[PDB]
Design a protein around this ligand. Structure first.
Ligand code: CYC
Ligand code: CYC
Ligand code: CYC
Ligand code: CYC
Ligand code: CYC
Ligand code: CYC
Ligand code: CYC
Ligand code: CYC
Ligand code: CYC
Ligand code: CYC
Ligand code: CYC
Lengths: 266, 162, 75, 172, 172, 162, 162, 172, 172
């Protein structure tokens, strides 16, 4: 996005990122950069140990035996990708990680969760992974030679608006990674076809003045509430409380049976 | 983790399939190896302190310069000797973990992954640890299956370091 | 000519353990790839190594993009 | 995931300690129990389709609102997803039985299942009833005495029942 | 998405009953205004560029702080994005007019747009004012009597205005 | 959900373009087909009960073993006959939905997707439902565009099962 | 084909790794199972004709309508019986292949992959073949590990069918 | 991200005004300071490995709980990840020094870092201590008078210290 | 991929015949040699780095033109590639020994290697000589009677020699 929203949302680096294309007759440093970019983006910005590198796959990329898309497929199908994204993750978290790593976006619909779940159940992890890489979306966005990059913060054709908001649920910052078993943040949002407020970068913080407590810290409690007291006017509720009253807010939320969806520092 | 049971279930889950006779044979091989691996782990554990000290002394003998020249990466002082003994104890303890688990998974997750950056950043020669592993392999006093499995883990570490 | 090790995947089947070389010509700007972020660099003979299990997809892609499959060679 | 061995290994590494004697003897006792574990895994696997189909049939018999139009198991795609969920729970129960540890079942299947169901409106209590039906069907299959070497499989049966209970509890 | 027919179909299937005579006659009535629906879609499409540009000009004249330097419509990137958002909203309104149902407009365009605009800092009230201007123009265009067969298009005009209202309520 | 209007909008939105004259002609074709579809659906609804019972009887006649063989998947008892009649009624009702919608979308969303898994896990023969659909084709008594469109849906279901 | 050795090699090759003790244990399990598998395959192929004839007769008795009503998919005529016996022989031969190989790989390669759309295309119910495989389970006379491995493959085929 | 020039450019563009005379003279003063800024970047880069290794050694000596088994710097993978974090923080501090602006730190290096450390269980206070050690070592290296033209580099040293302190406060 | 069992399975399935008694007896004889095969695989794996490094050093001792500047092994990247290739060939030879069939080595490493090396300007003769040196080191290591149960390993050594021959003839 433009700078004025970019600094607020903490997505400046994504906006200024330039797609990396492996051209013909590329030098050694260009193949090195492509391999590094693929490892960074497909493995979700983990510190990749040299013992986890795909030496044969990157040799085939180096000798121009395979394309960038093929190397991306090899990294995605590799046991390293399985270990850190599949074997200890729920299926819905796993496929949103696949959407982030392979297509550079957040899931748009619950039907996309129904797809890749049935696809896994029929054809295994390999068929499920190949669905993303062989998709029309991957072809039109990246082709055979462009390293996949995150696209959820930019307006795409055939995109739902919610994706942009949901993008902030799968991209938590430039210095973040998809390393830690974890549950998807988008489960209820996808199932009920909703959107959640974006609290990313500096958007989550709120004014304090003298209303914050001793340590000048406010907390935002996003809860789902119903009538169990006073009249409830909305199903969604947001409470801004100081640290000193946080426990009290939690307990009164708890004794009314309201479910806490998110708690963040504001 | 690279252990036969976890590998078998990982392969089945990646294929989304139930456990067939292939996975059952994997479990049968694991069962055939496990008792020898466990008493090897206990033999290495009961003799761990003397093995670690002897390996440290063997490294100091083959590379005498490590005990004389000053430097944070050497064992000239007691701090360096304690660090060296601790490293060899780490090698032996995760080797026992490998024997217990029936695979190289403990070595991969706990010691092997990123060890090159470790030995390069703190300028530790991997040849020292290779010598320590060779001493452990030559002095563990095991026989048969237990010896073969323990030696496989020790040579796995040696090959990783070279 | 390499690639088989990484192209075939992990089906392990004898049917998937075959790769083939596609020779494609005439990849131009069509109405099908109007919104392609990347640009076509070559329209002459390009060679794509396709495993058996993806031969259905790739040729469709080729057929969708106006490319002409002139030859397919066993690897 | 962890197996029965790697769980002890990870705890020991997080302490910097060698496996004790008692821990090695516990693992050796688990090893001597291995053949019955493999037999139970094979028996549940060999009857997996029958287990899933019969349990689903019984669940829809006692909960007709599931297959009633507008119910959560109504329409082919929902019913197929329901049968798939039953089969998935059974498969990860067999994986946990094979490894001797519940980590694969917890991480792949049960983590986030309850919230997914609630979000989607899938009745978790009905899923728990189906899991309990597969529970007793599989426990009768594991405990079937003919055509097998005789012996006491009570510990393995208790462990498999515990996995089926952990799944049932998780979905509701 | 849903169209005017599939909405009734999905509701009937959830209830598990055939469409009644009243619902079938209602759909016959719906296809009776099909020609005017096509005319309204075509008329908005044929003047979409004028609708977006004139509405944007009126919005920037009434709200100069948008195009003022530092404003959210200032810089050519932000301005182009604003004009694109107006055209996108108009396009999805035409989609909803064509289908006879608001599912495409809500699910694809409107859902998450308030949160998106709040996150971006785009003034939702300003977008709502622009959408209201597009509404006024497009309803004049749909109601233009020149060069068309005489008839009563009050129902389709009200339906289109309802879609434009959903858009304006959604953005703010 | 394939219907002419939803598919026209889906195609235009996938190309990010406004609805042109192509989509207008799609809507015109839908308009030309809709009245015949609505009378087809009404005629099937008013005759739904006789069609379902006759289709069930035709299936029982062609496959007599369904009425004496004991088993959960057969109709030798009243429970099986009720399940069979309910399934045929589902087929007829979703066909009426397709006629209302103008496409095979109701059949794809509610009945076709996942029917193979159901017929396999509950050992139901798709040939039974094919014969029921054939009876509905032969006895719906429709003519013209109503018949042609209804037969297209019934043949779509038949081809899905075969 | 899916076998312990090939799966061990494939997952070691996926990581660019030499074969560690885990793969050796997998090979040891294969060695433990292999003699029983070979003797089971020999025992199955000795009376393979009798087993196939008995399975075909069991299907005919369990499903009498298959030998009576006319149709390409039924065994009323001699051509149908020859096709049926050929199908059962296919099942038994691939089961012996699985016993030799040590996994369900031959079944997946030659029989399981695509069986459902063959059965749907040629209107052959899987329940017939389920009855045939149940007869093979009940009449092979195998004992011990031979029995358990052969029954695991036969039950694998049954579960894929139902 | 911004450099020392584009920061005031973006501020002026939001104001919709030209850079005043005072801003242009301040930028000219920054340009006259440029050579010593390039020396500071070069000196930190040429000693980056020593800075990272010595600071890590000091941090693990002061906090042995990190490197004992079960600690967050125990095991080779975790220790190597820690060493990479140290190197990365030092590299981004050099980036900030080179550009003359801190936006590269917030945009990239500190963007969600505290969230990452909390999620993984990395002790942020220990990271801040390591960053402080790298700060003291790098400031000593920059201030070294041997082998360089003598001059006052107090302003650039204060700026580098500010970048280091901001990195430390992002995780503390 | 094929192993020793699935290979004969594939010929029998192509002929549509059950495995004869002779084939089953040959497979039983293979099973009786399985312990020796596992020992050979383990010994080569446990000495893989030594075999590759000693063979590479000997290959550069003679044929010095590889490591002179302008040679194919000159520069660090090309030396690392050469070492990598020797280790890869040895690894696939161990795979072939483990499976008892040469399919893995031919399909994944050998087929197309002579053309790749020609189109890169890699000397096939020199890498074939390196494969011969790896052969001789590995065969000496496998045929080491110390610390192993005594027996006749001539058949497995001949099979390993055949695999090494395959890779030397296919790469030259
Ligand atoms: C030629 C290869 C050399 C040789 C081999 C040889 N080995 C055995 C027997 C065994 N070797 C093993 C191997 C292992 N046990 C383990 O736990 C591990 C690690 C997983 C390994 C690799 C085993 C289990 C046996 C059987 C029991 C025993 O220890 O004897 C033999 C004996 C005959 C047989 O094949 O069983 C032989 C001949 N002998 C030589 O002289 C060659 C140098
Ligand atoms: C309110 C929307 C305005 C209005 C509409 C209106 N239109 C018709 C009739 C028709 N219009 C069409 C449309 C098209 N024919 C084409 O070929 C194209 C391009 C693809 C279009 C858009 C058609 C086919 C008809 C029917 C034949 C005819 O020309 O009349 C009517 C008459 C009633 C009807 O529903 O058909 C009306 C009312 N008329 C107004 O007064 C509003 C300004
Ligand atoms: C504080 C940072 C220390 C310091 C620095 C300082 N440097 C200069 C002068 C120069 N430094 C350079 C730098 C380079 N020349 C190269 O080719 C390279 C590699 C690309 C580098 C890094 C240059 C070009 C100059 C100018 C020539 C000269 O040597 O004078 C100064 C002098 C003032 C100036 O701005 O030029 C200073 C102050 N001085 C100290 O005392 C600190 C320890
Ligand atoms: C070392 C001083 C301390 C320490 C560090 C530690 N960090 C991690 C993991 C990660 N570190 C980062 C940070 C970055 N990645 C980037 O790309 C950027 C540049 C913008 C930064 C700042 C990330 C994202 C991770 C996530 C995991 C990954 O592998 O990348 C670990 C690993 C934790 C684990 O393995 O579970 C560690 C150990 N730990 C200490 O104890 C020191 C105080
Ligand atoms: C060493 C004995 C000889 C030698 C080797 C050498 N090889 C290359 C380059 C490549 N080697 C391969 C081969 C493979 N890669 C794999 O992944 C596998 C398994 C499927 C194999 C068999 C490939 C594909 C390449 C090209 C990619 C790459 O360079 O990594 C080189 C480098 C050539 C160059 O840089 O142009 C070298 C030096 N060279 C000698 O002189 C020895 C005789
Ligand atoms: C002994 C063979 C030689 C030796 C040892 C020595 N090692 C270090 C420092 C470290 N050793 C490690 C290794 C590990 N940490 C782990 O968690 C594991 C995996 C379980 C391993 C293998 C690490 C990470 C360090 C650095 C951090 C630390 O201080 O612990 C030193 C000190 C180096 C320094 O600069 O402080 C020494 C002296 N020295 C000899 O001379 C022997 C030949
Ligand atoms: C059957 C007994 C009950 C039932 C089930 C049902 N479940 C869903 C949907 C999902 N189930 C899961 C769970 C998993 N998928 C996986 O891949 C894994 C293993 C790793 C698990 C645990 C998920 C993720 C979904 C959502 C995605 C999908 O639709 O497949 C449904 C469908 C709900 C819907 O269509 O909206 C159903 C019907 N329903 C009942 O009524 C039974 C009590
Ligand atoms: C114009 C009337 C007002 C205005 C608009 C404005 N919008 C954005 C940015 C975005 N708009 C969207 C919306 C959509 N994208 C889609 O694909 C769809 C259809 C499904 C919609 C509705 C999104 C997601 C963005 C962000 C991503 C992107 O910009 O591509 C901007 C730019 C904000 C920035 O800082 O760059 C602007 C300016 N602004 C005004 O002031 C007007 C009132
Ligand atoms: C009638 C032609 C034959 C027959 C029928 C029969 N069917 C079942 C069971 C089920 N039928 C379905 C089908 C559907 N459910 C849906 O929601 C829809 C889509 C809207 C369809 C098409 C399902 C899912 C089942 C299983 C669950 C249930 O019982 O409802 C049975 C009973 C099988 C059992 O094991 O209970 C029977 C008997 N039987 C005959 O003999 C006829 C020839
Ligand atoms: C016997 C149990 C019942 C029966 C048999 C029957 N089968 C067919 C035809 C086919 N059978 C197959 C199956 C396979 N072919 C393979 O290659 C394998 C895997 C190795 C299998 C299992 C196929 C593909 C066909 C169709 C093509 C062909 O005819 O070969 C028929 C003929 C049906 C037809 O339409 O021609 C029959 C009769 N039918 C009964 O009634 C028995 C109870
Ligand atoms: C426990 C739930 C039931 C039970 C089990 C039981 N099994 C054994 C022993 C063995 N079972 C096997 C299993 C297999 N052999 C194969 O080839 C395969 C398929 C690939 C399998 C699953 C084996 C190898 C043994 C050992 C040899 C033997 O048969 O004796 C025992 C005996 C004790 C032991 O642990 O060995 C027992 C108790 N017995 C029951 O009564 C329960 C119903």
């Amino acid at each position: 996005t433009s700078l004025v929203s970019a600094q607020r949302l903490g997505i400046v680096a994504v906006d200024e990122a330039i797609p990396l294309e492996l051209r013909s007759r590329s030098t050694e440093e260009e193949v090195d950069a492509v391999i590094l970019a693929v490892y960074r983006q497909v493995l979700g910005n983990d510190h990749l140990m040299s013992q986890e590198r795909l030496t044969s796959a990157e040799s085939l990329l180096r000798g121009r035996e395979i394309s960038v898309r093929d190397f991306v497929r090899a990294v995605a199908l590799s046991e390293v990708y399985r270990q850190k994204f599949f074997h200890s993750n729920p299926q819905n978290r796993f496929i949103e990680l696949n959407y982030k790593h392979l297509l550079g976006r957040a899931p748009y619909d619950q039907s996309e969760i129904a797809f890749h779940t049935d696809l896994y159940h029929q054809g295994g992890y390999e068929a499920e992974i190949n669905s993303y890489i062989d998709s029309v979306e991957y072809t039109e966005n990246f082709g055979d030679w462009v390293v996949p990059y995150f696209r959820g913060f930019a307006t795409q054709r055939n995109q739902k608006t919610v994706g942009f908001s949901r993008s902030f649920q799968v991209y938590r910052g430039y210095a973040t990674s998809d390393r830690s078993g974890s549950r998807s943040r988008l489960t209820r949002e996808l199932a009920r076809n909703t959107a959640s407020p974006v609290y990313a970068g500096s958007t989550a913080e709120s004014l304090r003045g003298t209303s914050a407590g001793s340590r000048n810290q406010m907390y935002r409690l996003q809860v789902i509430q119903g009538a169990a007291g006073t009249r409830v006017r909305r199903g969604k509720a947001e409470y801004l409380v100081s640290y000193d009253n946080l426990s009290a807010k939690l307990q009164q939320i708890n004794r009314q049976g309201d479910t806490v969806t998110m708690i963040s520092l504001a | 983790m690279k252990t036969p049971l976890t590998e078998a279930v990982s392969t089945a889950d990646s294929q989304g399939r139930f456990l067939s006779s292939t996975e059952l044979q994997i479990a049968f091989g694991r069962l055939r190896q496990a008792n020898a691996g466990l008493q090897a782990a206990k033999a290495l554990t009961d003799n761990a302190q003397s093995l670690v000290n002897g390996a440290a002394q063997a490294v100091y003998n083959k590379f005498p310069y490590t005990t004389q020249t000053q430097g944070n990466n050497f064992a000239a002082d007691q701090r360096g000797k304690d660090k060296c003994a601790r490293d060899i104890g780490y090698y032996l303890r995760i080797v026992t973990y490998c024997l217990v688990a029936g695979g190289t998974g403990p070595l991969d997750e706990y010691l092997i992954a990123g060890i090159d950056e470790i030995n390069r950043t703190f300028d530790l020669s991997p040849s020292w640890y290779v010598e320590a592993l060779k001493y452990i392999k030559a002095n563990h006093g095991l026989s048969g299956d237990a010896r073969d499995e323990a030696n496989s883990y020790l040579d796995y570490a040696i090959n990783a370091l070279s | 000519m390499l690639g088989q090790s990484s192209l075939v995947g992990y089906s392990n089947t004898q049917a998937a353990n075959r790769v083939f070389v596609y020779e494609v010509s005439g990849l131009r700007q069509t109405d099908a790839n109007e919104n392609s972020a990347h640009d076509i660099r070559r329209s002459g003979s390009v060679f794509i190594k396709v495993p058996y299990a993806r031969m259905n997809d790739e040729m469709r892609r080729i057929s969708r993009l106006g490319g002409t499959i002139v030859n397919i060679r066993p690897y | 995931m962890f197996d029965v061995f790697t769980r002890v290994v990870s705890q020991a590494d997080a302490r910097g300690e060698y496996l004790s004697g008692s821990q090695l003897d516990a693992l050796s006792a688990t090893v001597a129990e291995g053949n019955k574990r493999i037999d139970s895994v094979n028996r549940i696997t060999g009857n997996a389709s029958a287990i899933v189909s019969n349990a689903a049939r019984a669940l829809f018999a006692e909960q007709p609102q599931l297959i009633q139009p507008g119910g959560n198991a109504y329409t082919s795609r929902r019913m197929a997803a329901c049968l798939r969920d039953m089969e998935i729970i059974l498969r990860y129960v067999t994986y946990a039985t094979f490894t001797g540890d519940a980590s694969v079942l917890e991480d792949r299947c049960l983590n986030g299942l309850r919230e997914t169901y609630v979000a989607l409106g899938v009745p978790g209590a009905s899923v728990a009833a189906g899991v309990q039906k597969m529970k007793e069907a599989a426990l009768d299959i594991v405990n079937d005495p003919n055509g097998i070497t005789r012996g006491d499989c009570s510990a393995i049966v208790a462990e498999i029942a515990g996995y089926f209970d952990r799944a049932a509890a998780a979905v509701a």
